[PDB]
Ligand binder design. Structure first.
Ligand code: BCL
Ligand code: BCL
Ligand SMILES: COC(C)(C)C/C=C/C(C)=C/C=C/C(C=O)=C/C=C/C(C)=C/C=C/C=C(C)/C=C/C=C(\C)CC/C=C(C)/C=C/C=C(\C)C(=O)O
Ligand SMILES: COC(C)(C)C/C=C/C(C)=C/C=C/C(C=O)=C/C=C/C(C)=C/C=C/C=C(C)/C=C/C=C(\C)CC/C=C(C)/C=C/C=C(\C)C(=O)O
Ligand SMILES: COC(C)(C)C/C=C/C(C)=C/C=C/C(C=O)=C/C=C/C(C)=C/C=C/C=C(C)/C=C/C=C(\C)CC/C=C(C)/C=C/C=C(\C)C(=O)O
Ligand SMILES: COC(C)(C)C/C=C/C(C)=C/C=C/C(C=O)=C/C=C/C(C)=C/C=C/C=C(C)/C=C/C=C(\C)CC/C=C(C)/C=C/C=C(\C)C(=O)O
Ligand SMILES: COC(C)(C)C/C=C/C(C)=C/C=C/C(C=O)=C/C=C/C(C)=C/C=C/C=C(C)/C=C/C=C(\C)CC/C=C(C)/C=C/C=C(\C)C(=O)O
Ligand SMILES: COC(C)(C)C/C=C/C(C)=C/C=C/C(C=O)=C/C=C/C(C)=C/C=C/C=C(C)/C=C/C=C(\C)CC/C=C(C)/C=C/C=C(\C)C(=O)O
Ligand SMILES: COC(C)(C)C/C=C/C(C)=C/C=C/C(C=O)=C/C=C/C(C)=C/C=C/C=C(C)/C=C/C=C(\C)CC/C=C(C)/C=C/C=C(\C)C(=O)O
Ligand SMILES: COC(C)(C)C/C=C/C(C)=C/C=C/C(C=O)=C/C=C/C(C)=C/C=C/C=C(C)/C=C/C=C(\C)CC/C=C(C)/C=C/C=C(\C)C(=O)O
Ligand SMILES: COC(C)(C)C/C=C/C(C)=C/C=C/C(C=O)=C/C=C/C(C)=C/C=C/C=C(C)/C=C/C=C(\C)CC/C=C(C)/C=C/C=C(\C)C(=O)O
Ligand SMILES: COC(C)(C)C/C=C/C(C)=C/C=C/C(C=O)=C/C=C/C(C)=C/C=C/C=C(C)/C=C/C=C(\C)CC\C=C(C)/C=C/C=C(/C)C(=O)O
Ligand SMILES: CCCCCCCCCCCCO[C@@H]1O[C@H](CO)[C@@H](O[C@H]2O[C@H](CO)[C@@H](O)[C@H](O)[C@H]2O)[C@H](O)[C@H]1O
Lengths: 50, 48, 41, 69, 49, 40, 38, 56, 57, 38, 52, 48, 40, 38, 48, 40, 38, 48, 39, 56, 38
C-alpha cells in the first residue's frame, strides 16, 4: 500500500503475536477473553458534554 | 446463671458481642432501607 | 485461678443484664417510632 | 548520618548507581520511542510542529516486507 | 463497671476509638451529602454564576 | 498490663465525661441540621 | 515469649486490624457512592 | 485470644498475612481494572448511569 | 471429643485448614466470576429476572 | 498437650468453626436474596 | 518502637524500598499504556480534549 | 487529662499532628475549591 | 519511656493552648470566607 | 538493638514515612488539577 | 515551649524547614502563575 | 544529644526572630501582589 | 566505620546529591523551554 | 546566630551554595529570556 | 569541623558576601527594569 | 574528597569506568548510525538543510 | 593506601576527568557545526 490509514481502536488487536488467531483464538471461545482481544472505543470529555 | 461466665475473659465476651451486634445492625439497616425506601424518597425530594 | 472469679463474676452478670435490658428498651423505643413513621405490616 | 552505620556506603553506592543508570536509560529510551520526543529525528522541529496526542496503538502498519536497507 | 478498663492500655483504647469515630464520621458525612444534596446545589449556584 | 484499679476509676470518669460532651455537641449539630434540611 | 508480651502485642495487633478494616469500609462506601456494583 | 501468639510466631504470621493481603489487593484491583464497568482509568469520569453494564 | 488433638498437632492442623479454606474460597469465587449468570463485576446491577440463564432443552 | 489446655483449645476452635459457618450462612442468605441459583 | 525489636529495620527497609519502587514503576507503566494518561504524547491536551 | 501523654514521644505526637493537619487541610482545600468555584472564575477573568 | 508525668503535664498545657490558638485563627478564616461566599 | 535504639529509629522512620505520604498527596493534588480521573 | 527542641539536631531542623519552604514556594508560585496569568500576558506583549 | 538549655533558649529566640521577619516580608509581598492583581 | 566517618561521608554525599539532583533541574527547565510536556 | 555553622566545614557549605546559585541563575536566566523576548529580537535584527 | 571563633568569623564573612551579592543583584534588576519592565 | 579512594579501590573503579564509557560510546554511535538523520557513513556529505527530518 | 597517595591519585583523576569532558565538549561543538540536532 502506498499510504496507511490508522484504524479505529475497536478494530485494533491488543495482542501483537502473529499466530494468535490460529493457535489460541481458533480454540478459545471464552466470552470475556474474546472481549479483551481488541481495544475499546474512545471519545473525549467535550464530545460527551462533560 | 452467672456460673456460665466462669473461666472466660470478660473482654472476649464483650468483643464478640460487639462484633455480633455491629454485623447484625448493618444487615438489618440495609434490610430496613430496602423495605421502607427512606433515603430514596427523601433524596429524590431533595435532588429534584 | 483465671478471670472473673465468683464475686466479680456475679457483679459482671449484674452489669451485663443491666446493659442488655437498657439496650432492649432503647431498641423497643426505636421500633415504636419507626412503626409510627412507616409501618412494615 | 546513622543511616550509614546500618548500611555500608560501599554497597549502597553501587546499588544507587545501578538504579540511577537503569532509570535514566529507561527514560531516555521511552522518549526516543515516542513521536513527540524522538529528538534524534525531529529535534529541530519547533514546539508548534512537534506531534501531539499520537498514542494510536496501530500508528504504523504491522505487516509488510523488509525495506531495501 | 470501671473494671472493664483494668488490664488494658489507655493509648490503645484512644487509638481504636479515634479510628472508629473518624471512619464513622466520614461514612455518615458521605451519607448525609447524598441525602441532603448540599454541596451539589451550592456548587450549582456558584458555578452557574 | 497497666490500668490498675484507681487509674481505671479515673480514666472511666474522664471517658464518661468526654463521651457525654461528644454526645451533646453532636445533638446540637443534629438539631441545627434538622431545621436546615429535615431528612424525614 | 511470656504471656505479658503476647498480651501487649495482641493489643497493638487488634488496634491495627481495626484501623485497616475501618479504612477499607470508608473506601468501600466511597466506591459505592461513585459506582454501585449491585 | 492472645494465646494464639504462643502457638504461632507473630513474626511469621504477620509476614504471611502481609504477603497474602498484598497479593489479594493487587488481584482485586486488576480484576476491576480489566473489566468494562470498572476501568476507572479510561472511564472513571463517567457517571453511574453511563457506566457499562453486562448483557441481560 | 477433644482427644483428637492428641493425635494431630493443632498448629499443623489450623495451618492446613486455613490454606484449604482460602484455596476453596478463591476457586469458588473464580468459578462464579468466569460464569455468565454470576459475573457480578459486570452484571451485578441486574435484577434476578434480567440475569442470564443457561440454554434449556 | 494437657487435657485442660486441650479443653480450652477445643472450646475456642469449636466456637471459631461454628461462627465461621454462621457467617457463611448469612453470606449465602444475602446471595440468595440477590440472585437465586435454583 | 518495639516492633523494631521483633523485625530487623534493615530488612524491613530494604523490602519496603524494593516494593515501593516496583509499585511506582507498575503504576507509571499502566498510566503510560492507557489512552487517557499517555502523558508523553497527550500531556499538552486539556482535560476536556483528553480521551475518555 | 494530661496522663494520656505519659510514655509517648512528644516528637512522634507532633509528627502525627502535622500529618493529620496537612492531609485534612489539603482535602478540605480541594473540597472548598470545588464548592466555591475559586480560583476558576478569577483565572477565567485574568486569562480571557 | 519518655514524657514522665511532670513533662507530660507541661506538654499538655502547651498542646491545649496551641489548639485554642489554631481553632480561633481558623474561626477568623471561616468568618471571612462566609462573608465572601457563604455555603448553604 | 536496645529499646532506646528502637525508639530513635522509630522517630526517623515515622517522620520519613509520614512526610513521604504528604509529598505523594501533593503530587496527587497536582495531577488532579491537570487531569482528573473521576 | 523551647523544650520541644531538646534532643534534636539544629541542622536537621533547618534542613527540613528549608525543604518544606522550597517545595511550598514552588507549588504556590506555579499556582499563582496560573491564577494571575502574569508571565503569559507579559510574554505576549513582548513577543508580538 | 545537643542543643542544651541555654542553647535551646537562644535557638528559640533566633528562630522566633527569623519566623517573624519571614512572615513580615511575605505579608508585604502579598500586599504588593494584591495591589497589582487582586485574586478575589 | 565510626560515627565521625559517617558524619564526614554524609557531608560529601549530601552536597553531591544536591548538586546532581538539581543540575537535573536545570536540564528539565531547558527541556521544558524546548518542548513542554504539559 | 553564628553557632549554626559549628561542626560543619566551610568548603562543603561553599560548594553547596555555589551549586545552588549556579542552578538558580541558569534557570532564572532562561525564564527571563522567555519573558523579555531577548535576545530573539536582537538576533532577528542581526540575522535579517 | 568548625569551632566557636571559626564559626563567628566565617559568619561575618558570609554575611558580608551575601550583602554584596544582594546589592549587585539589586543594581542589575534596576537596570533591567529600566530596559524592559516585566509588569 | 580524595578519601573516597580509601573506600573504593582506584584500580577497580578505573576498570569499571572505562568499560562503562566504552559501552556508552559504542551504543550512542550505533544509535546514531541506525538513524535516518545521522547515518553519517552514507549521508554525511549532505548539508544541514538536506539532512532528513522527522515528520512534522 | 595512605591519605597522601589518595591525594595524588585524586589530583590526577580529577584533571583527567575534566580534560576528557572538555575534549568531548569540543567534539560536540564540531558536530553542532556539521549538523545541529535542535
Ligand atoms: C457471586 C459471588 C458473590 C459473593 C458470594 C459469597 C458467598 C456466598 C460467601 C462469600 C464469602 C466471602 N467472600 Mg465473596 N462474593 C462476592 C464478592 C466478593 C468480593 C468482591 C471483590 O466482589 C470479595 C473481596 C469477597 C470476599 C469474601 C470473603 C470475605 C469471604 C470468604 C472468606 C474466606 O476465604 O475465609 C478464609 C478463612 C478465614 C479464617 C477467614 C474468615 C473470615 C470471616 C469473614 C469471619 C470469621 C468469624 C469468626 C467467628 C472469627 C471471630 C473473631 C471474634 C469476633 C473476636 N466476595 C460476590 C458478590 N462470598 C464466604 C464467606 O465466608 O462469607 C462470610 C461465603 O460464604
Ligand atoms: C476556597 C477556599 C479559600 C481558603 C479558605 C480557608 C479556610 C476557611 C481556612 C483556611 C486555612 C488555611 N489556609 Mg486556605 N483558603 C484559600 C486558599 C489558600 C492558599 C492559596 C495560595 O490559594 C493558601 C496558601 C492557603 C493557606 C492556608 C493555611 C495558612 C491554613 C491551613 C493551615 C494548614 O495548612 O495546616 C496544615 C499544615 C501544613 C504544613 C500544610 C502543608 C501542605 C503543603 C501543600 C505541603 C507541601 C509539602 C512538600 C513541600 C510538597 C513538595 C511537592 C513537590 C511536587 C516535590 N489557603 C481559598 C481562597 N483556608 C485554615 C486555617 O487555619 O485558617 C486560619 C482555615 O480554617
Ligand atoms: C433481618 O434479618 C433477617 C435474617 C432477614 C431476619 C432474621 C433475623 C434474626 C434471626 C435475628 C436474630 C436476632 C437476635 C438473636 O436472638 C438478637 C439477639 C440480641 C441480643 C441478645 C443482644 C444483646 C445485647 C446485649 C448488650 C448490648 C449488653 C451490654 C452490656 C453492657 C454494656 C455491660 C458491660 C459492662 C460490664 C459487664 C462491666 C464489667 C464489669 C466487670 C468486668 C467486673 O465487675 O468484674
Ligand atoms: C449510614 O448507613 C449505616 C452505616 C448502615 C447506618 C447505620 C449506622 C449505625 C448502626 C451507627 C452506629 C453508631 C454507633 C454505635 O454503634 C456510635 C457510637 C459511638 C460512640 C460510642 C461514641 C463515643 C465517643 C466517646 C468519646 C469521644 C470519648 C472521649 C473521651 C475523652 C476524650 C477523654 C479520655 C480521657 C483521657 C485520655 C484521660 C483519662 C485519664 C487517664 C488515662 C488517667 O488518669 O490515667
Ligand atoms: C474477585 O473476588 C475474589 C478476590 C476472588 C474474592 C476474594 C476472596 C477471598 C478469599 C477473600 C479473602 C478475605 C479475607 C479473609 O480470608 C481477608 C482477610 C483480612 C484480614 C484478616 C485483614 C487483617 C489485617 C490486619 C492488619 C493489617 C493488622 C496490622 C497490625 C498492626 C499494624 C499492628 C502492628 C504493631 C506492632 C506489631 C507493634 C507492637 C509490637 C509489640 C508490642 C511487640 O513487638 O512486642
Ligand atoms: C464448584 O463446586 C466445588 C467447589 C467443586 C464443590 C466443593 C466441594 C468440596 C470438596 C467442598 C468442601 C467443603 C468443606 C469440607 O470438606 C468445607 C469445610 C469447612 C470447614 C471445616 C471450616 C472450618 C473452619 C474453622 C475455623 C475458621 C476455625 C477457627 C478457629 C479459631 C479462630 C480458634 C483459634 C483460637 C486459638 C487457637 C486460641 C487458643 C490457643 C491456645 C489454647 C494456645 O495456643 O495455647
Ligand atoms: C492501577 O493501580 C493498581 C496498581 C492496580 C492499584 C494498586 C493497588 C495497591 C495494592 C496499592 C498498594 C499500596 C500500598 C500497599 O500497602 C502502599 C503502601 C505504602 C507504604 C507503606 C509506604 C511507606 C513509605 C515509607 C517510607 C518511604 C519510609 C521512609 C523512612 C525514612 C526516610 C527513615 C530513614 C531512616 C533513618 C534515617 C534511620 C537512621 C538510623 C538510625 C536512627 C539508627 O541507626 O539508629
Ligand atoms: C495551592 O493549593 C493548596 C496547596 C491547597 C493551597 C495551600 C494550602 C495550604 C494548606 C498551605 C499551608 C501553608 C502553611 C501551613 O501552615 C505554611 C507554613 C509556613 C511556616 C510555618 C513558615 C515558617 C518559616 C520560618 C522561618 C523562615 C524561620 C527561620 C528561622 C531562622 C533562619 C533562624 C535560624 C536560627 C539560628 C541560626 C540559631 C542557631 C543557634 C544554634 C544552632 C545554637 O544555639 O546552638
Ligand atoms: C517514564 O516514566 C517512568 C520511568 C516509567 C516513571 C518512573 C518513575 C520512578 C519510579 C522514578 C523514581 C525516582 C527516584 C526514586 O525512586 C529517584 C531518586 C533519586 C535520587 C535519590 C538520586 C540521588 C543521587 C545521588 C548522588 C548522585 C550522589 C552523589 C554523591 C557524591 C558524588 C559524593 C560521593 C563522594 C564521597 C562521599 C567522597 C567522600 C568520602 C569520604 C569522606 C570517606 O569515604 O571517608
Ligand atoms: C521562575 O519560576 C520560579 C523558579 C518558580 C520562581 C521562583 C523562585 C524562587 C522561589 C526563588 C528563591 C530564591 C532565593 C530564596 O529563597 C534565593 C536565595 C539566595 C541566597 C540566600 C543567596 C545567598 C548568597 C550568598 C553568597 C553569595 C555569599 C558569599 C560569601 C562569600 C563569597 C564569602 C566566602 C569567604 C569566606 C566565608 C571566608 C572563609 C573563612 C574561613 C573559612 C575561616 O576564617 O575560618
Ligand atoms: C539515546 O542515547 C541514550 C544512551 C539512551 C541517552 C542516555 C545517556 C546517558 C544516561 C548517559 C550517561 C552518561 C554519564 C553518566 O553519568 C556519563 C558520565 C561520564 C563520566 C563520569 C566520565 C568520566 C571520565 C573520566 C576519565 C576519563 C578519567 C580519567 C582519569 C585519568 C586518565 C587519570 C588516571 C591516571 C593516573 C591516576 C595516573 C597516575 C597514577 C598514580 C597517581 C598512582 O598510580 O599512584
Ligand atoms: C469531604 O468532606 C469531608 C472530609 C467528609 C468533611 C469533613 C468531615 C470531618 C469529620 C472532618 C473532621 C475534622 C476534624 C475532626 O475532629 C478536625 C480536627 C481538628 C483538630 C483536633 C485540630 C487540632 C489542632 C491542634 C493544634 C494545631 C495544636 C498544636 C499544639 C501546639 C503548637 C503546642 C505544642 C508546642 C510545643 C512547643 C510542644 C512542647 C513540647 C514539650 C515536650 C514541652 O514543652 O515540654
Ligand atoms: C518579594 C516577593 C515578591 C513580591 C512581589 C510579588 C508581587 C509583584 C508585584 C507587582 C507590582 C508591579 O505593579 C504594577 O506595576 C506595573 C508596571 O508596569 C503597573 O502597570 C502600569 O504601567 C503599565 C506599563 O506602563 C501599563 O501597561 C499598566 O496598565 C499600568 O497599570 C501596574 O499598574 C502595577 O500594579
Amino acid at each position: 500500500g502506498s499510504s496507511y490509514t490508522v484504524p479505529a481502536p475497536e478494530h485494533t488487536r491488543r495482542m501483537r503475536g502473529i499466530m494468535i488467531q490460529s493457535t489460541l483464538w481458533s480454540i478459545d471461545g471464552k466470552r470475556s477473553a474474546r472481549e479483551r482481544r481488541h481495544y475499546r472505543p474512545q471519545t473525549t470529555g467535550a464530545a460527551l458534554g462533560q | 446463671m452467672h456460673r456460665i461466665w466462669q473461666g472466660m475473659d470478660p473482654q472476649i465476651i464483650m468483643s464478640g458481642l460487639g462484633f455480633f451486634l455491629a454485623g447484625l445492625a448493618l444487615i438489618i439497616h440495609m434490610w430496613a432501607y430496602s423495605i421502607t425506601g427512606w433515603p430514596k424518597y427523601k433524596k429524590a425530594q431533595y435532588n429534584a | 485461678k483465671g478471670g472473673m472469679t465468683e464475686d466479680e463474676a456475679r457483679r459482671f452478670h449484674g452489669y451485663f443484664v443491666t446493659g442488655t435490658l437498657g439496650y432492649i428498651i432503647v431498641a423497643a423505643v426505636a421500633h415504636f417510632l419507626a412503626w409510627q413513621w412507616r409501618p412494615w405490616f | 548520618h546513622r543511616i550509614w552505620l546500618m548500611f555500608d556506603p560501599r554497597r549502597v553506592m553501587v546499588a544507587m548507581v545501578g538504579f540511577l543508570a537503569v532509570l535514566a536509560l529507561v527514560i531516555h529510551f521511552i522518549l526516543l520511542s515516542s513521536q513527540r520526543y524522538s529528538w534524534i529525528e525531529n529535534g529541530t522541529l519547533s514546539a508548534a510542529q512537534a506531534p501531539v496526542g499520537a498514542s494510536a496503538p496501530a500508528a504504523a502498519a504491522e505487516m509488510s516486507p523488509l525495506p531495501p536497507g
